[PDB]
Known about the structure:
Chains D, E: (2R,3E)-phycocyanobilin binds at residue 82. Chain A is mostly helical.
Amino acid sequence: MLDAFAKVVAQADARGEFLSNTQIDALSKMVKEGNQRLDIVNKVTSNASAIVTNSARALFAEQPQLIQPGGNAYTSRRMAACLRDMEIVLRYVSYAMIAGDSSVLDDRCLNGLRETYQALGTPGSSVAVAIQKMKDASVALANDTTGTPIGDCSSLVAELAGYFDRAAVSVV
Amino acid sequence: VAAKVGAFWKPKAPKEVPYKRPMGANTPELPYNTVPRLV
Amino acid sequence: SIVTKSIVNADAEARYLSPGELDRIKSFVLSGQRRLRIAQTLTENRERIVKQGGQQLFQRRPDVVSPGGNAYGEEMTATCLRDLDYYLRLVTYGIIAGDVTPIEEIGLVGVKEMYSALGTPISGVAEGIRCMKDVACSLLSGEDAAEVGFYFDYTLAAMQ
Amino acid sequence: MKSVITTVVSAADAAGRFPSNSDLESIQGNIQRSAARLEAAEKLAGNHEAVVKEAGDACFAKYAYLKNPGEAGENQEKINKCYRDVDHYMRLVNYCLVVGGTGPLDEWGIAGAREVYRTLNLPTSAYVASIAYTRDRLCVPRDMSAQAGVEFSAYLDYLINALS
Amino acid sequence: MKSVITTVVSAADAAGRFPSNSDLESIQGNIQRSAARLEAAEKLAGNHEAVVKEAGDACFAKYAYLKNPGEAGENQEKINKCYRDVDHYMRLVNYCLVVGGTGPLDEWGIAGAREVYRTLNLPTSAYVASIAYTRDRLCVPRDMSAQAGVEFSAYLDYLINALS
Amino acid sequence: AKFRGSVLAERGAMITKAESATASVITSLRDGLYSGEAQLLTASGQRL
Amino acid sequence: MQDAITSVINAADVQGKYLDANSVEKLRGYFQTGELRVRAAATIAANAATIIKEAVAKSLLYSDITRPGGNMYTTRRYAACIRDLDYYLRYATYGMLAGDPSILDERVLNGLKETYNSLGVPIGATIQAIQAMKEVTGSLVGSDAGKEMGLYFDYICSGLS
Amino acid sequence: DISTFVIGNEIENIKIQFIKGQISVKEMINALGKSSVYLKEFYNPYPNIKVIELGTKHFLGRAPNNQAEIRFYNQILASCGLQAFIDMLTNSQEYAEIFGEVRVPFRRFPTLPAANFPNTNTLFDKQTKQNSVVIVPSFKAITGN
Amino acid sequence: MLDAFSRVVVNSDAKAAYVGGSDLQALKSFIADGNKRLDAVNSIVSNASCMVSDAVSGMICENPGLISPGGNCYTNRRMAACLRDGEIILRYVSYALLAGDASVLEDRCLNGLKETYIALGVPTNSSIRAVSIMKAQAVAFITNTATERKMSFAAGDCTSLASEVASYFDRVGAAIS
Amino acid sequence: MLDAFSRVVVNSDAKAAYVGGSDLQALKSFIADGNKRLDAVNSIVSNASCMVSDAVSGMICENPGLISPGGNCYTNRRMAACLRDGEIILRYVSYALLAGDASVLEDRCLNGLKETYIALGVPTNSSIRAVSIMKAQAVAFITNTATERKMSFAAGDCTSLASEVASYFDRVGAAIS
Ligand SMILES: *C(C)[C@H]1/C(=C/C2=NC(=C\c3[nH]c(C[C@H]4NC(=O)C(C=C)=C4C)c(C)c3CCC(=O)O)/C(CCC(=O)O)=C2C)NC(=O)[C@@H]1C
Ligand SMILES: *[C@@H](C)[C@H]1/C(=C/C2=NC(=C\c3[nH]c(C[C@H]4NC(=O)C(C=C)=C4C)c(C)c3CCC(=O)O)/C(CCC(=O)O)=C2C)NC(=O)[C@@H]1C
Ligand SMILES: *[C@@H](C)[C@H]1/C(=C/C2=NC(=C\c3[nH]c(C[C@H]4NC(=O)C(C=C)=C4C)c(C)c3CCC(=O)O)/C(CCC(=O)O)=C2C)NC(=O)[C@@H]1C
Ligand SMILES: *[C@@H](C)[C@H]1/C(=C/C2=NC(=C\c3[nH]c(C[C@H]4NC(=O)C(C=C)=C4C)c(C)c3CCC(=O)O)/C(CCC(=O)O)=C2C)NC(=O)[C@@H]1C
Ligand SMILES: *[C@H](C)[C@H]1/C(=C/C2=NC(=C\c3[nH]c(C[C@H]4NC(=O)C(C=C)=C4C)c(C)c3CCC(=O)O)/C(CCC(=O)O)=C2C)NC(=O)[C@@H]1C
Ligand SMILES: *[C@H](C)[C@H]1/C(=C/C2=NC(=C\c3[nH]c(C[C@H]4NC(=O)C(C=C)=C4C)c(C)c3CCC(=O)O)/C(CCC(=O)O)=C2C)NC(=O)[C@@H]1C
Ligand SMILES: *[C@H](C)[C@H]1/C(=C/C2=NC(=C\c3[nH]c(C[C@H]4NC(=O)C(C=C)=C4C)c(C)c3CCC(=O)O)/C(CCC(=O)O)=C2C)NC(=O)[C@@H]1C
Ligand SMILES: *[C@H](C)[C@H]1/C(=C/c2[nH]c(/C=C3N=C(/C=C4\NC(=O)C(CC)=C4C)C(C)=C\3CCC(=O)O)c(CCC(=O)O)c2C)NC(=O)[C@@H]1C
Ligand SMILES: C=CC1=C(C)[C@@H](Cc2[nH]c(/C=C3N=C(/C=C4\NC(=O)[C@H](C)[C@H]4CC)C(C)=C\3CCC(=O)O)c(CCC(=O)O)c2C)NC1=O
Ligand SMILES: C=CC1=C(C)[C@@H](Cc2[nH]c(/C=C3N=C(/C=C4\NC(=O)[C@H](C)[C@H]4CC)C(C)=C\3CCC(=O)O)c(CCC(=O)O)c2C)NC1=O
Ligand SMILES: C=CC1=C(C)[C@@H](Cc2[nH]c(/C=C3N=C(/C=C4\NC(=O)[C@H](C)[C@H]4CC)C(C)=C\3CCC(=O)O)c(CCC(=O)O)c2C)NC1=O
Ligand SMILES: CCC1=C(C)/C(=C/C2=NC(=C\c3[nH]c(/C=C4\NC(=O)[C@H](C)[C@H]4CC)c(C)c3CCC(=O)O)/C(CCC(=O)O)=C2C)NC1=O
Ligand SMILES: CCC1=C(C)/C(=C/C2=NC(=C\c3[nH]c(/C=C4\NC(=O)[C@H](C)[C@H]4CC)c(C)c3CCC(=O)O)/C(CCC(=O)O)=C2C)NC1=O
């Protein structure tokens, strides 16, 4: 677990060097983004119950064999375990948004998860469909104005969409 | 030092016009009740 | 040399030097007394160009001389300044030859695979060449500085 | 899914045109073909537990070593999962006679099925010995029309050549 | 704003008459040249960021005096305005290939340009070094068609004649 | 003056060609080129 | 190839030094004669065909070389020999402008004595044709230019023997 | 590989033009041999008699066949120069038969001509700049014309 | 996309059931009334040129601010892109009547249409008027109550073909609304 | 003042953008259906003096309060000045049909016309009926559905020109009112 600022420190310690003058200036742009990166984390945390439930309901409507008897999300215990995997992947994506680096996401959440769902029988191609539905619910909610001043947050929601795409190809 | 990639003489455009649009005859034809790439 | 480069252009096409190529070689030799005076203005200012050009470099790129950089240490910074003297010497060769051929064959051919083998930042050497150009071009007039400015300009682009 | 009307409308959209009068002919030719194709599918749906029961035990008559200990028919639960699997394939053929194409058999019962049966050690020769029995038990009087039995016996031929 | 269209609908407006047969016969030539001049516009629209880079430093290769203190491009944000001034003119030449006449270059590029560049001490000999480099690097099999490069290089020395 | 006038277009054109190469090696490095498994298996592709 | 400028820069560069006062005098000696070389090189390029025509007539034309049984007897063998005199006149004019015979050792003389031995081309008659080109050339370009051009005509003849 | 004898920008546009699939292997090889890198490497330091034996070696994978070929390429290098030489090799019918427009030339161990086997082996078994000898300066004159 | 035949397959695969009974009966009605349905598609594609231009120019003469400078159909570049939209919408309602199921309209045409008509600033109430104008023309060319042009058909009741194509047009309406 | 090609380049100038392959394709269809535009102007300008004599006398037979004293088309002088008023309007519409937009119609014919007719006392509602009969006359000749004269064309659909010419005639009516 290291953020975007500690990532460039760890890369420079492997070379044994001080930070370059263009590396300080690129970290001063991240401080300037700042207040806006905290708007994206605030907007997907305040709606985290509805990102999960609306995209769970949309998943069992297109794939009805998941809740048929014998399907993977058929029981009370297996349904409540599908809903908390969606809530855990959404939790570590918002951790990686506030850090600016996908290092909390693929050490705490994504590492070893593909080989775990295969040991359990969980269809990893269907977990990826449920992650991609939470992506569209998050980026449609990241760029609405709704209490924020008007401006350009386009390269920050292109980074939020990139974390959801990384988690969706790592479960399968 | 002194790299000139692209149109360095002007700031890039905001590009913040992302919206959905029906892809008539370009919508991907998906399977029903299933997911791609075999099982 | 302007003479050598014009001969290999004719020999490749199997012909004699055209009157436009010969007309360029004529004004090259007639301007030799003036071009020899520009090269001697830099030859008598090595201490100011290499010292100031190197002091300005270590202020725009302090990490190459800081602990952990390539030019860290008394003997390593000296080799750092030794290279700015290699490239100031080649620029006087090119002012006299009239062409970038002396700079190209000595110190530009194979230079990227060379510095990458020693672990030297190629962009830190181009920064030190741009800082020598600032000192050197301030010693010359309007014309005679555009001439000197080109050989510093080519060494930057050709080095990257 | 490639279907009765769907495969013409999807080709009249890639050209961007309206439904042509030469695009309404292949629609009418596909609606008249689906009359006998639905009669086969009504027969199979109305009487399926009888045609599955006699096609399942034709596998065990031919392969009586599957009931041996250590094999794929060892318990009674492994037997019941064999008659379940023949009823799964007869259901997908019933979907192929309604759609009018091998779409439901491809996606829902053939894709990745060969790799499943290898990991679970099931002989694909035993799945095809119960569909080959159904193909030639068909009689053109007393079961269905002579036109209905042509469509019914071609989707059983598509499944036989896909498992084996 | 100066086209094949606007000169014949304002000549008949000045006479106070209807569109005649000689007016429609000019719009027929707008059909015929359109394959060659819209090809030159489409090549310029996809390649403009490399043709104002290589023509913008044909100004400063020829005129090294412009980077002295007290001159036209003396800091970096005046050199970037020089490439911006070249990219304005290439956009207006692209508009003339679309419109079909020197309307967008007369109104938006040429009118008032003598008064601006004399007040602001910008030499027009360095503007025409940028435009005549682009006219002399055209290659009519390599870069466009044969007749696409006839009128790409006809709007380029319309700028050269109006800035000199 | 005559010597410079004859070499001014030659010199500026060879500097533009050297900077078009640097811009291409930078977009090519970021575009995934030189990252292949056959480039990292050479000793000069490890220095790059 | 390297010319007089290249050879002076090399003597300084092989010590790591700049151009001293002795190097600048050797460079002034070249720049002084540089306008006489450009004038001779322009008059040779214009009369290149007349010099070889006049030089063959003086040496090779009515001898055992062109009669039946000579090396230049057949028409392919006559055209092949005057294409060689174009080599010598063209490369001696490169060496005169450069002030160095370095382009003759590389582009002309390497492997040339072995080519003529394989084919049977006479060496003693080839040298006499190059020496006739030295007279015809030294009459077009005068004595100052004609004495510089003949310094490289002689280089070819000494390396061809 | 060119890293040790080029500055870095001579053949950079030929590389990008090829990786985009815009030019074929035959155009990339014609455009590569008529560049300033080839002229500086295999035309300037050598006579035309040695430039012929190196041109067939790099673009045809074999030494010169016979005397009628040496006197045919020698007349091209005298009149037109180097770039007309490269076009006569890449646009020949021998090239299009063995390499076509999709293959890169190779060493091409020959058999049938009288001395083409031992001659082609002396060219490809010597290292670059091993010496300044001309392998096939000419063919010893056979009686006749 | 699904027609009437694919939809009963995907509705019975979702239950693991055989297609037969009440769901197979509604497919016989599609086969029986097959010639009758194909005239209703024929009585639209023969008028599809002037069904569109009567509708787009019909909404102009009811809201003439759209051609004033500032209106959304002011320039010829904006009016040509509206005539192209009325033909695209009518091309998919003809596709959805021929297939007997609204899923080709709901996916290729109306999916992400309301989010595109606000980012460009197309007026919503003006757009659903031209759909309502086109809706009245379609239920008239199908019932043969068109007062400026009649058609030669056979005798019979084409009710619920007109009611089905009425249910597609307000689905186009309720999408962008 | 502008045409359809220069309407494109003033939209791209607002964004400082090059007009390239996206909205070049809308202009390549303008050139391709371009002989259709030139036959459609030619049929308007060939029936122009029957067309203006019928729309003004059609306005008289709708409202015969303009032939009584107190009428605005009362006199012999005012009938010539109304029959000249209605062929200026036909002349600037056929400029706008030939060009491709209605910016010759705004600048040179409709600037100050509303302020003129108020200061003259020319009645507004009788004038909209004069250009509505000209609207119905224009779409009859360029779809070739005129009852008293038929012209020889090549075959095809020109309904989008006739939906463009009715937007020009509705622009004249909206600015008079
Ligand atoms: C409702 C839309 C109409 C109407 C429709 C009827 N059409 C009837 C018969 C019929 N229709 C067609 C044309 C159609 N069949 C095709 O195969 C194709 C193109 C490939 C098309 C366009 C034909 C050829 C026929 C058969 C004529 C005959 O044999 O009599 C019909 C009677 C049969 C039925 O009800 O299914 C009806 C009612 N008629 C109406 O009154 C409304 C306005
Ligand atoms: C025609 C003379 C045939 C023939 C017919 C017989 N079938 C008999 C029993 C039987 N048939 C079926 C038909 C089954 N196959 C299908 O493909 C379909 C529909 C998709 C169906 C329904 C079944 C299930 C049975 C078993 C019924 C039973 O065993 O009671 C049969 C014997 C009568 C009887 O046993 O009740 C005959 C004579 N047999 C022939 O040899 C020719 C080729
Ligand atoms: C053709 C008869 C000439 C010729 C010229 C060469 N041009 C080379 C590169 C090049 N050319 C242009 C201008 C051109 N590109 C455009 O996109 C447009 C207009 C839309 C024009 C007029 C540019 C900007 C460039 C550099 C970038 C590029 O390669 O596209 C070229 C390559 C060598 C070089 O980099 O300088 C040549 C050889 N080709 C011929 O054979 C004759 C001399
Ligand atoms: C001159 C005869 C042209 C011609 C003109 C057309 N007139 C069209 C419609 C139309 N004309 C009138 C006026 C007329 N009707 C009357 O009741 C009276 C007297 C009281 C007169 C003078 C009216 C009112 C209308 C209808 C207006 C509308 O529909 O809004 C017309 C279009 C219909 C058609 O195509 O016939 C045309 C083309 N016709 C010709 O061919 C000659 C060249
Ligand atoms: C981007 C996805 C949004 C958007 C963001 C902007 N916010 C801007 C300024 C701003 N943000 C904050 C709140 C900061 N404190 C917090 O506690 C949190 C999290 C809850 C955050 C982000 C403050 C206090 C300010 C104002 C302070 C200042 O600007 O100095 C902002 C800049 C304003 C502007 O550009 O006009 C932007 C763009 N705005 C959007 O439209 C999207 C949806
Ligand atoms: C006839 C169908 C109308 C009607 C028309 C009248 N217009 C009268 C005068 C008039 N009209 C214009 C506008 C016209 N002239 C132009 O130059 C241009 C465009 C550039 C246009 C559109 C002007 C400027 C004038 C005043 C000049 C003049 O007096 O001739 C007019 C005469 C009024 C009078 O003196 O009695 C008439 C009758 N009036 C009607 O009732 C119907 C609706
Ligand atoms: C729509 C209003 C018409 C109609 C138009 C069509 N015209 C077609 C071809 C065509 N039209 C013209 C006439 C026009 N072009 C001119 O250059 C001039 C005068 C200078 C005029 C008056 C010509 C020459 C052509 C020939 C072009 C060709 O065929 O290559 C046409 C065919 C399709 C097309 O090319 O656009 C149509 C549909 N036809 C109608 O029925 C309505 C009434
Ligand atoms: C839901 C969208 C999909 C689905 C989920 C599903 N998951 C499980 C069981 C487990 N999931 C985990 C997941 C994690 N553990 C971690 O430590 C992390 C962070 C690295 C994750 C994401 C674990 C450990 C289990 C097993 C323990 C448990 O009881 O949960 C189940 C239940 C499987 C079972 O009960 O045997 C289900 C159903 N399955 C689907 O069908 C959806 C596509
Ligand atoms: C497959 C399904 C499908 C569609 C339904 C259409 C939908 C659609 N229309 C437009 C684009 C447009 N649509 C209209 C249409 C209208 N504006 C109005 O004022 C009227 C109310 C209405 C028609 C009568 C206009 C005027 C534009 C152009 C807007 C502009 O360019 O500013 C665009 C943007 C693309 C572009 O601008 O080229 C799209 C996706 N296109 C499709 O691909
Ligand atoms: C739509 C058409 C359109 C144009 C063509 C340009 C025309 C234009 N250019 C400049 C402005 C300029 N143009 C240049 C250009 C040059 N100076 C040089 O060193 C060279 C001589 C040359 C090009 C190589 C410079 C440096 C400025 C800034 C002048 C200044 O700030 O004093 C200005 C003054 C306004 C400003 O400073 O921003 C204007 C109107 N602008 C337009 O809107
Ligand atoms: C101010 C401008 C203006 C118009 C252009 C028209 C446009 C128009 N037409 C119709 C209504 C209609 N339009 C048509 C279309 C056609 N009829 C045919 O016979 C042709 C084949 C085809 C044109 C090519 C049909 C069939 C109807 C239904 C009523 C009818 O039968 O006419 C309606 C809706 C009426 C309703 O149902 O409520 C409108 C607004 N009306 C206007 O107010
Ligand atoms: C066997 C093949 C063969 C041929 C043909 C040949 C020709 C040949 N012709 C020559 C000269 C010449 N040839 C001519 C010929 C002509 N003058 C005219 O007006 C006529 C048009 C034309 C004859 C019909 C003249 C005048 C000379 C002498 C030119 C000179 O000395 O300047 C010479 C140089 C002197 C010499 O004769 O040795 C050769 C070698 N050699 C060969 O081996
Ligand atoms: C650039 C340096 C260079 C040179 C000089 C060169 C020479 C050269 N001279 C050749 C032949 C020849 N050279 C001559 C020359 C002569 N005959 C005489 O009698 C005269 C004495 C002499 C001319 C002065 C002849 C006759 C042949 C042809 C031999 C034959 O056909 O058998 C050939 C064989 C190819 C051919 O026949 O055209 C070469 C390669 N190649 C080079 O690369």
